[PDB]
Amino acid sequence: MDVFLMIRRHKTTIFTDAKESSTVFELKRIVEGILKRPPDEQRLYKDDQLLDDGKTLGECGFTSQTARPQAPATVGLAFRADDTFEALCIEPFSSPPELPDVMKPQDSGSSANEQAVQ
Amino acid sequence: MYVKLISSDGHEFIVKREHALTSGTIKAMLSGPGQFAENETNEVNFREIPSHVLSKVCMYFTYKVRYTNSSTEIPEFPIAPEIALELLMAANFLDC
Amino acid sequence: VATLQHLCRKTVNGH
């Protein structure tokens, strides 16, 4: 019945809320309000995969076990125009002490610089 | 309705208005008695709260919403020598 | 339920 969803973007993450039986189309509206992107030049990703707006959170993969106050759901939003990308790689905010979204080893990478985006 | 919170680090996080209404100050900012810039609406700005901290307290912003009508378990957030120090003035600065 | 303000004091008050 209810499910918590979240959109993922580098340094940018939006907490989105919707009903498991709502409609990927409804969650899409939040993007046009935060990123201002319509259901055309934008793509969603769920569970290391691509989100399908042809199904609902429950008929897509969320129900009440992969989205809630205990375990929220994250979607990757990327816009493809000619040759550009956005999501795909979710840059996690600052969390070197705890909240290790993954096994971030951090062996080396700080006082050496690496390409750097600008 | 949702609001975006920015950390002095550069990270950004947005929580539904009601989800952010758990700050006591973020809700008043959505319409605080201030001027209106061509942009920047329903957003929060903390010049003294890092990204990892604004998200820490933010979890209670949503946890408190569904726990406000519970009154049975209501666990407690984990605190240790690594995270929680900033919440001292930041967590308290965000009302309850 | 309380915000993070009370949980943060738990460590400073005890820890």
Short mmCIF file of C-alpha atoms in Angstrom, two decimals:
data_model
loop_
_atom_site.label_atom_id
_atom_site.label_comp_id
_atom_site.label_asym_id
_atom_site.label_seq_id
_atom_site.Cartn_x
_atom_site.Cartn_y
_atom_site.Cartn_z
CA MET A 1 0.00 0.00 0.00
CA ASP A 2 2.68 2.55 0.97
CA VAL A 3 6.35 2.68 -0.07
CA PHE A 4 9.20 5.20 0.39
CA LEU A 5 11.19 6.07 -2.76
CA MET A 6 14.24 8.31 -3.28
CA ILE A 7 15.95 9.70 -6.39
CA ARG A 8 19.73 9.53 -6.69
CA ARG A 9 21.94 12.21 -8.22
CA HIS A 10 25.58 13.14 -7.61
CA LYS A 11 25.95 15.25 -4.53
CA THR A 12 22.22 15.73 -5.23
CA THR A 13 19.70 13.33 -3.60
CA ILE A 14 15.95 14.01 -3.29
CA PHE A 15 13.70 12.21 -0.81
CA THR A 16 10.54 11.31 -2.75
CA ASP A 17 7.37 9.77 -1.30
CA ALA A 18 4.60 7.91 -3.16
CA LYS A 19 2.11 5.03 -2.83
CA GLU A 20 3.15 1.50 -3.88
CA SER A 21 0.14 1.60 -6.21
CA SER A 22 0.76 5.23 -7.25
CA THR A 23 2.53 5.26 -10.64
CA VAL A 24 6.14 5.80 -11.77
CA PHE A 25 4.54 8.70 -13.67
CA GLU A 26 3.61 10.43 -10.39
CA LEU A 27 7.17 10.11 -9.01
CA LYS A 28 8.39 11.49 -12.36
CA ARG A 29 6.63 14.80 -11.59
CA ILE A 30 8.94 15.38 -8.60
CA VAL A 31 11.88 15.29 -11.03
CA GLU A 32 10.29 18.03 -13.18
CA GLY A 33 10.14 20.03 -9.93
CA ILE A 34 13.64 19.29 -8.63
CA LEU A 35 15.56 18.58 -11.85
CA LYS A 36 12.75 19.90 -14.08
CA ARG A 37 12.88 16.89 -16.44
CA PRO A 38 9.89 15.38 -18.24
CA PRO A 39 9.37 11.70 -19.05
CA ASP A 40 11.57 11.92 -22.18
CA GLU A 41 15.21 12.98 -21.73
CA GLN A 42 15.43 11.26 -18.33
CA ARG A 43 16.01 7.65 -17.20
CA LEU A 44 15.50 5.94 -13.83
CA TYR A 45 17.48 3.07 -12.26
CA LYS A 46 16.35 0.74 -9.45
CA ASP A 47 18.49 -1.95 -7.78
CA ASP A 48 21.55 -1.70 -10.06
CA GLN A 49 19.03 -1.74 -12.93
CA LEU A 50 16.72 0.54 -14.95
CA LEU A 51 13.34 1.63 -13.52
CA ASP A 52 10.31 0.92 -15.74
CA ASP A 53 7.46 3.47 -15.67
CA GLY A 54 5.27 0.77 -17.27
CA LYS A 55 4.80 -0.76 -13.82
CA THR A 56 4.07 0.49 -10.32
CA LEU A 57 6.37 0.36 -7.27
CA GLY A 58 4.83 -2.99 -6.26
CA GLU A 59 4.68 -4.22 -9.87
CA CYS A 60 8.19 -2.85 -10.42
CA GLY A 61 10.12 -3.73 -7.24
CA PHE A 62 9.38 -1.78 -4.05
CA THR A 63 6.24 -2.97 -2.22
CA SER A 64 6.84 -2.34 1.51
CA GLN A 65 10.16 -4.15 1.92
CA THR A 66 12.43 -2.09 -0.36
CA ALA A 67 11.14 1.38 0.56
CA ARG A 68 10.15 2.78 3.98
CA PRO A 69 11.42 4.49 7.14
CA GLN A 70 13.67 1.46 7.74
CA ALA A 71 14.80 0.79 4.15
CA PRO A 72 14.11 3.46 1.54
CA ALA A 73 14.33 2.90 -2.24
CA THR A 74 16.75 4.88 -4.43
CA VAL A 75 16.32 5.55 -8.15
CA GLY A 76 19.06 6.78 -10.51
CA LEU A 77 18.04 9.67 -12.74
CA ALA A 78 20.14 10.45 -15.80
CA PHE A 79 19.29 12.55 -18.89
CA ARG A 80 20.51 11.27 -22.28
CA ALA A 81 20.82 14.07 -24.87
CA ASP A 82 22.98 13.41 -27.96
CA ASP A 83 25.79 12.18 -25.67
CA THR A 84 25.43 13.13 -21.98
CA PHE A 85 24.75 11.24 -18.72
CA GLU A 86 23.89 12.01 -15.07
CA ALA A 87 22.90 9.17 -12.70
CA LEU A 88 24.53 5.76 -13.38
CA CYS A 89 27.17 6.77 -10.84
CA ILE A 90 25.68 8.01 -7.59
CA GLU A 91 28.19 10.23 -5.82
CA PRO A 92 27.55 9.65 -2.11
CA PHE A 93 27.72 12.78 0.08
CA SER A 94 30.39 13.02 2.81
CA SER A 95 30.44 9.86 4.97
CA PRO A 96 34.04 8.83 5.62
CA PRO A 97 33.40 8.10 9.33
CA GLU A 98 30.34 5.82 9.06
CA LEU A 99 27.32 5.22 6.79
CA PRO A 100 29.55 3.29 4.39
CA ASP A 101 27.03 2.88 1.54
CA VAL A 102 29.58 0.33 0.25
CA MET A 103 33.04 -1.11 1.00
CA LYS A 104 34.68 2.25 0.19
CA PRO A 105 38.30 1.34 0.94
CA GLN A 106 39.71 4.85 0.38
CA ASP A 107 43.22 3.40 -0.03
CA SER A 108 44.46 6.65 -1.62
CA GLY A 109 42.81 9.69 -3.26
CA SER A 110 42.94 13.19 -1.74
CA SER A 111 46.32 14.97 -1.90
CA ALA A 112 47.10 13.55 -5.36
CA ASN A 113 44.11 14.82 -7.38
CA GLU A 114 42.73 12.69 -10.24
CA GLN A 115 41.45 14.35 -13.45
CA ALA A 116 39.00 16.41 -11.37
CA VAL A 117 35.71 17.45 -13.02
CA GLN A 118 35.36 21.12 -14.02
CA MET B 1 5.77 19.06 -1.17
CA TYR B 2 9.48 18.68 -0.31
CA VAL B 3 12.45 20.87 0.69
CA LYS B 4 16.18 20.69 -0.09
CA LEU B 5 18.86 20.93 2.62
CA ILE B 6 22.42 22.03 1.80
CA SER B 7 25.53 21.18 3.85
CA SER B 8 28.67 23.34 4.18
CA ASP B 9 30.43 20.45 2.40
CA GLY B 10 28.47 20.90 -0.85
CA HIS B 11 26.16 17.86 -0.67
CA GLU B 12 22.40 18.41 -1.14
CA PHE B 13 19.41 16.46 0.23
CA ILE B 14 15.68 17.11 -0.17
CA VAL B 15 13.00 15.97 2.31
CA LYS B 16 9.21 16.23 1.81
CA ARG B 17 7.76 19.35 3.46
CA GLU B 18 6.07 17.22 6.13
CA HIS B 19 9.29 15.19 6.30
CA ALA B 20 11.21 18.45 6.78
CA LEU B 21 8.45 19.84 9.02
CA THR B 22 10.16 17.76 11.74
CA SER B 23 12.81 20.49 11.98
CA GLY B 24 10.55 23.23 13.40
CA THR B 25 12.73 25.77 11.54
CA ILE B 26 12.76 24.32 8.01
CA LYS B 27 8.94 24.49 7.89
CA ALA B 28 8.94 28.16 8.94
CA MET B 29 11.55 28.84 6.23
CA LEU B 30 9.34 27.46 3.44
CA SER B 31 7.32 30.67 3.97
CA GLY B 32 9.30 32.59 6.62
CA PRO B 33 8.70 36.34 6.57
CA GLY B 34 11.57 36.99 4.13
CA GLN B 35 11.92 38.28 0.54
CA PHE B 36 11.34 35.94 -2.43
CA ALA B 37 14.26 35.39 -4.83
CA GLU B 38 13.54 34.58 -8.50
CA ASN B 39 14.48 31.03 -7.45
CA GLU B 40 15.45 29.04 -4.32
CA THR B 41 12.03 27.94 -3.01
CA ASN B 42 11.13 25.41 -0.28
CA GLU B 43 14.85 24.90 0.45
CA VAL B 44 17.05 24.87 3.57
CA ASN B 45 20.55 26.28 4.14
CA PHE B 46 22.77 25.24 7.07
CA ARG B 47 26.11 27.08 7.26
CA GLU B 48 27.03 24.96 10.31
CA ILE B 49 25.88 21.43 9.39
CA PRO B 50 27.82 18.92 7.28
CA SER B 51 26.09 16.63 4.75
CA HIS B 52 26.47 13.52 6.94
CA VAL B 53 24.88 15.41 9.86
CA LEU B 54 21.94 17.02 8.00
CA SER B 55 21.03 13.50 6.85
CA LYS B 56 21.46 12.00 10.31
CA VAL B 57 18.88 14.28 11.95
CA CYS B 58 16.82 14.16 8.74
CA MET B 59 16.26 10.44 9.33
CA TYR B 60 14.44 11.43 12.53
CA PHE B 61 12.48 13.97 10.45
CA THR B 62 10.81 11.03 8.69
CA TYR B 63 11.10 8.54 11.57
CA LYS B 64 9.31 11.01 13.87
CA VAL B 65 6.48 11.53 11.35
CA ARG B 66 5.38 7.87 11.44
CA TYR B 67 6.38 7.58 15.11
CA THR B 68 4.28 10.59 16.17
CA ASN B 69 1.19 8.36 15.96
CA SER B 70 2.89 5.19 17.28
CA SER B 71 3.91 5.40 20.96
CA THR B 72 5.04 1.78 21.47
CA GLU B 73 8.65 1.11 20.38
CA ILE B 74 10.40 4.29 19.19
CA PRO B 75 14.03 3.15 19.25
CA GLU B 76 17.00 5.54 19.59
CA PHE B 77 19.53 6.80 17.01
CA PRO B 78 23.08 5.48 17.38
CA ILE B 79 25.62 8.03 18.68
CA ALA B 80 29.42 7.66 18.94
CA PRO B 81 32.77 9.44 18.70
CA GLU B 82 32.52 10.04 14.94
CA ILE B 83 29.01 11.32 14.33
CA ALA B 84 26.57 13.13 16.66
CA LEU B 85 28.85 15.97 17.82
CA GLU B 86 27.59 18.28 15.05
CA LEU B 87 24.00 17.25 15.84
CA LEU B 88 24.53 18.79 19.30
CA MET B 89 23.97 22.33 18.00
CA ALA B 90 22.49 21.21 14.65
CA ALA B 91 20.02 18.59 15.93
CA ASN B 92 18.86 21.00 18.66
CA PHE B 93 18.85 23.91 16.17
CA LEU B 94 16.27 21.94 14.17
CA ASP B 95 13.60 22.05 16.92
CA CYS B 96 12.15 18.56 17.47
CA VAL C 1 9.67 10.08 19.15
CA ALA C 2 12.26 12.77 19.46
CA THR C 3 14.40 14.56 16.87
CA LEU C 4 18.18 14.09 16.72
CA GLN C 5 18.69 16.83 19.35
CA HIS C 6 17.91 14.42 22.22
CA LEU C 7 19.81 11.45 20.73
CA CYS C 8 22.92 13.65 20.34
CA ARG C 9 22.82 14.56 24.06
CA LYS C 10 22.82 10.84 24.98
CA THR C 11 26.51 10.57 24.01
CA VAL C 12 27.52 13.97 25.43
CA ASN C 13 25.53 13.36 28.64
CA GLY C 14 26.83 9.80 29.17
CA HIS C 15 29.78 9.53 26.75
#
